[PDB]
Design a protein around this ligand. Structure first.
Ligand SMILES: *[C@@H]1O[C@H](CO)[C@@H](O[C@@H]2O[C@H](CO)[C@@H](O)[C@H](O)[C@H]2NC(C)=O)[C@H](O)[C@H]1NC(C)=O
Ligand SMILES: *[C@@H]1O[C@H](CO)[C@@H](O[C@@H]2O[C@H](CO)[C@@H](O)[C@H](O)[C@H]2NC(C)=O)[C@H](O)[C@H]1NC(C)=O
Ligand SMILES: *[C@@H]1O[C@H](CO)[C@@H](O)[C@H](O)[C@H]1NC(C)=O
Ligand SMILES: *[C@@H]1O[C@H](CO)[C@@H](O)[C@H](O)[C@H]1NC(C)=O
Ligand SMILES: *[C@@H]1O[C@H](CO)[C@@H](O)[C@H](O)[C@H]1NC(C)=O
Ligand SMILES: *[C@@H]1O[C@H](CO)[C@@H](O)[C@H](O)[C@H]1NC(C)=O
Ligand SMILES: *[C@@H]1O[C@H](CO)[C@@H](O)[C@H](O)[C@H]1NC(C)=O
Ligand SMILES: COc1cc(/C=C/C=O)ccc1O
Ligand SMILES: [Cu+2]
Ligand SMILES: [Cu+2]
Ligand SMILES: [Cu+2]
Ligand SMILES: [Cu+2]
Length: 547
C-alpha cells in the first residue's frame, strides 16, 4: 500500500520521433496502482522533472480528503521541480478499474496509469473469476512537446493541434509509421476468459473500441459494477473506464485466424473541425495455434463510422448499475436542489494589439452556465480553509443567465461570447442535487464527458434537444441508473444526474476534454462541514505545496 512515483524526464520514440516527456518512474504509460476495496494507499510523488505538476486519483471519492485530490489551483498549488508531496488515497465504495493522471496543464498526455481495485479479502467478483486481466489504456501521442502544443494554442487563441496518433498502452499499433514492431499484444488461451480494463486516457475524443471476432460482456464502469450486457463494440469517453469480459473461443486447430485486432477510433461529429481520426490497433494472439494460423494479417473488427451518433447512443443506453444484495444502490429520490448547467464552447474578445486564430478571429474559450472558469493563483481549497477573500466568488448559478433554444443549430454570432470568472457553488453537507447538463449548439453541438471529483453520481436521464423540466423527469431511471464519475452528455442533448453531497471538501467539476478544461468548461463544489466528526473535512496536511 505504498508507492514512490518519481516524475522523470524520459526520452521516448514513437512514429520515429524522439522527444523527452514527463513520465512516472520512466514508464509511459506509468505504473498501475493495485489495491483492494477499502484500502488506503500512500503515494510519495518526487518531481524530478522540469515543470510544476500535480497528480489526481481519478474516480476516488477521497472522503473528507480534498488535500490529496490533485487538481492544480483547485485543491493544491503545484509540486515544484525538485519538490515532493505525499498523497493519501482513501478507497471506499470503488471496486473495479480507475486510473490516475497528472492534473496540471496537458501533462496527463503522458503522465497517467491504471488503478486496479480488486474485491477485498473474503469477497469475490459478481462474475466468474477471469483467467487473466489486462489494462487497455487508450491514449494520444503528439510528436511535438505537449507543452508546446498547449502554449501555441494559448498564444494564438485558436484550436489545439490534433494528435499525430491514437494509441493502445502507449503504442499506435500496426498501421502507423515506425510502429508495427512494438504494437501492443496480449496472449490468450482457448477456452479462457479475460477481463479487459479499458481506460480512455486520451485528451480529446470519445472512442469506439472493439475486438475482431470477440464479443465483449461489459461488467463495470468507473469502479461500480453494471448489469452485464454483451456487445460487438463499446463507446468510451475520456475519464471513463469500462470493464468487460472477453471469451477466447476461437479454434486453435488452424481453421481460424490466430490473431485478432483490438481497435479503437474516435466518435466525432463536427465535420468542420480537424480530428485525429487515425485508428489504433493491438493484437490478441492465440498462442497454442499452429504458425500457419498467423500467416496473414490479424482479423479486423467492424467499427462504427466516426460520425455514427446512433451507435454511440445505442451503447450508452445499455448502461445500468448492478443492483444485488452484495452490491446495493441508493438512488436519491427526493431532490433538495435542481441545477441546469449549459455547456458551451465560446469565444472571448482577442486581446488589444493582437490577432487571434479562433472563430471570427476571437479567442477560444468555454463555459458552464456562461461562466468561463479561470484558475486562481491561490488554490481554492487553501482559500476556503483560511477564509482568504478575493480568490473565488461563491455564486456559481443554478441555471443559465439567459434561456434560449439551446440546441438550435448555428446560433447567431453574438451568442458565441462568454465571460471569465472564478465562481464556485457552496452546498451544505448532505444536500441532494439533481444536476442537468445541457449542451448548446454554440460553435457546434458536441458530446462533452462531464466529470465530478469527490463523488460518483446516478445518471437518471438523458435525451436529445432541450431538457424539459416538466416532462423529461417522468421517464428517469430511478431504479438502476448507472453510477458513474464521468457522463457522456449527448451531442446536442442533455443528461441528468443525482448525488448526495456528503463529502466535505472542495471538488472540481469539468469536461474531461483537456482543451475544454483549460478554456474554462469547469466549476467547483464546496461542500461545507456537517455535524459530527464524520462530516468534517480533514485538516490541512503540514507540507502542502506553497502558492
Ligand atoms: C454570456 O456572457 C457574455 C458576456 O457577458 C454575453 O455577451 C454580452 O451580451 C451583452 C448583452 O447583449 C452585450 O451588451 C455584451 O457586449 C456582450 N459581451 C461580449 C459580446 O463580450 C452573452 O450574451 C452571454 N451568453 C449567453 C447568456 O448565452
Ligand atoms: C509553478 O508554481 C508556483 C506556485 O504556484 C508558481 O509560483 C508562484 O507564482 C505566483 C504568480 O502567479 C507568485 O505570486 C508566487 O509568489 C509564486 N510562488 C513561488 C515562486 O513560490 C510558479 O509561477 C509556477 N511556475 C510556472 C512556470 O508557472
Ligand atoms: C520532501 O520535501 C520535504 C519538504 O516539503 C523535504 O524536507 C524532504 O527532505 C523531501 N524528501 C526527500 C528529499 O526525500
Ligand atoms: C500545429 O499544426 C500546424 C499545422 O496545421 C503547424 O503549422 C504548427 O507548427 C503546429 N504546432 C506545433 C506546436 O507543432
Ligand atoms: C486502420 O486504418 C488503416 C489506414 O486507413 C486501414 O488500412 C486499416 O484497415 C484500419 N484498421 C482497422 C482495424 O480498422
Ligand atoms: C494598438 O491598438 C490600438 C487600438 O486599436 C491602435 O490605435 C494602436 O495603433 C495599436 N498599436 C500599434 C499598431 O502599434
Ligand atoms: C428549437 O430549435 C429546433 C431545432 O432547430 C427546432 O426544431 C424547434 O422548433 C425550435 N423550438 C422553438 C420553440 O423555436
Ligand atoms: C475545437 O473547438 C472548436 C474550434 C473551432 C475553430 C476555430 C478556428 O477557426 C471551432 C469550433 C470549435 O468547437
Ligand atoms: Cu480524470
Ligand atoms: Cu477526477
Ligand atoms: Cu479532473
Ligand atoms: Cu467538452
Amino acid at each position: 500500500t505504498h508507492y514512490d512515483f518519481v516524475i522523470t524526464e524520459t526520452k521516448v520514440t514513437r512514429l520515429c520521433h524522439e522527444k523527452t516527456i514527463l513520465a512516472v518512474n520512466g514508464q509511459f504509460p506509468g505504473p498501475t496502482i493495485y489495491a483492494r476495496k477499502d484500502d488506503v494507499v500512500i503515494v510519495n510523488v518526487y518531481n524530478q522533472g522540469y515543470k510544476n505538476i500535480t497528480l489526481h486519483w481519478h474516480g476516488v471519492d477521497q472522503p473528507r480528503n480534498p488535500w490529496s485530490d490533485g487538481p492544480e489551483y483547485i485543491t493544491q498549488c503545484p509540486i515544484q521541480p525538485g519538490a515532493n508531496f505525499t498523497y493519501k488515497i482513501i478507497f471506499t465504495e470503488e471496486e473495479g478499474t480507475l486510473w490516475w493522471h497528472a492534473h496540471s496543464e496537458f501533462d496527463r498526455a503522458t503522465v497517467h496509469g491504471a488503478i486496479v481495485i480488486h474485491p477485498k479479502r473474503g469477497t469475490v467478483y459478481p462474475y466468474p473469476k477471469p483467467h487473466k486481466e489486462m489494462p487497455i489504456i487508450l491514449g494520444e501521442w503528439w510528436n511535438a512537446d505537449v507543452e508546446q502544443i498547449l502554449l501555441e494554442s494559448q498564444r494564438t487563441g485558436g484550436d489545439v493541434n490534433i494528435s499525430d496518433a491514437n494509441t493502445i498502452n502507449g503504442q499506435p499499433g500496426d498501421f502507423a509509421p515506425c510502429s508495427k514492431e512494438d504494437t501492443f499484444k496480449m496472449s490468450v488461451e482457448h477456452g479462457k476468459t479475460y477481463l479487459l480494463r479499458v481506460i480512455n486516457a486520451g485528451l480529446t475524443n470519445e472512442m469506439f473500441f472493439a475486438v475482431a471476432g470477440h464479443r465483449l460482456t461489459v461488467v463495470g464502469t468507473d469502479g461500480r459494477y453494471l448489469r452485464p450486457f454483451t456487445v460487438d463494440y463499446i463507446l468510451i469517453s475520456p475519464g471513463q473506464t469500462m470493464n468487460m469480459l472477453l471469451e477466447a473461443n476461437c479454434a486453435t486447430d488452424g481453421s481460424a485466424n490466430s490473431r485478432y485486432y483490438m481497435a479503437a477510433r474516435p466518435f466525432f461529429t463536427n465535420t468542420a473541425v480537424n480530428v485525429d481520426d487515425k485508428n489504433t490497433t493491438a493484437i490478441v494472439e492465440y498462442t497454442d495455434a499452429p504458425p500457419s494460423a498467423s500467416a496473414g494479417p490479424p482479423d479486423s473488427p467492424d467499427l462504427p463510422a466516426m460520425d455514427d451518433i446512433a451507435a454511440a447512443t445505442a451503447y450508452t443506453a445499455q448502461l445500468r448499475s448492478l443492483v444485488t444484495k452484495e452490491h446495493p444502490i441508493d438512488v436519491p429520490m427526493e431532490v433538495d436542489e435542481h441545477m441546469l448547467v449549459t455547456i458551451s464552447v465560446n469565444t472571448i474578445p482577442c486581446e488589444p494589439n493582437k490577432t487571434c486564430a479562433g472563430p471570427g478571429n476571437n479567442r477560444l474559450a468555454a463555459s458552464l452556465n456562461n461562466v468561463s472558469f479561470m484558475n486562481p493563483t491561490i488554490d481554492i481549497l487553501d482559500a476556503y480553509y483560511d477564509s482568504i477573500s478575493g480568490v473565488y466568488e461563491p455564486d456559481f448559478p443554478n441555471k443559465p443567465p439567459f434561456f434560449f433554444n439551446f440546441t438550435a443549430p448555428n446560433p447567431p454570432q453574438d451568442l458565441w461570447f462568454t465571460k471569465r470568472g472564478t465562481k464556485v457553488k457552496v452546498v451544505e453537507y448532505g444536500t441532494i442535487l439533481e444536476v442537468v447538463f445541457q449542451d448548446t449548439a454554440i460553435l457546434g453541438a458536441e458530446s462533452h464527458p462531464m466529470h465530478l471529483h469527490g463523488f460518483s453520481f446516478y445518471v437518471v436521464g438523458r435525451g436529445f434537444g432541450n431538457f424539459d423540466k416538466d416532462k423529461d423527469p417522468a421517464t428517469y431511471n430511478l431504479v438502476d441508473p448507472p453510477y458513474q464519475n464521468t457522463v457522456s452528455v449527448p451531442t446536442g442533448g442533455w443528461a441528468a444526474m443525482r448525488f448526495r453531497a456528503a463529502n466535505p471538501g472542495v471538488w472540481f467539476m469539468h469536461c474531461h476534454f483537456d482543451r475544454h478544461t483549460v478554456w474554462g468548461m469547469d466549476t467547483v463544489f464546496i461542500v461545507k462541514n456537517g455535524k459530527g466528526p464524520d462530516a468534517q473535512m480533514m485538516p490541512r496536511p503540514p507540507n502542502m505545496p506553497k502558492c
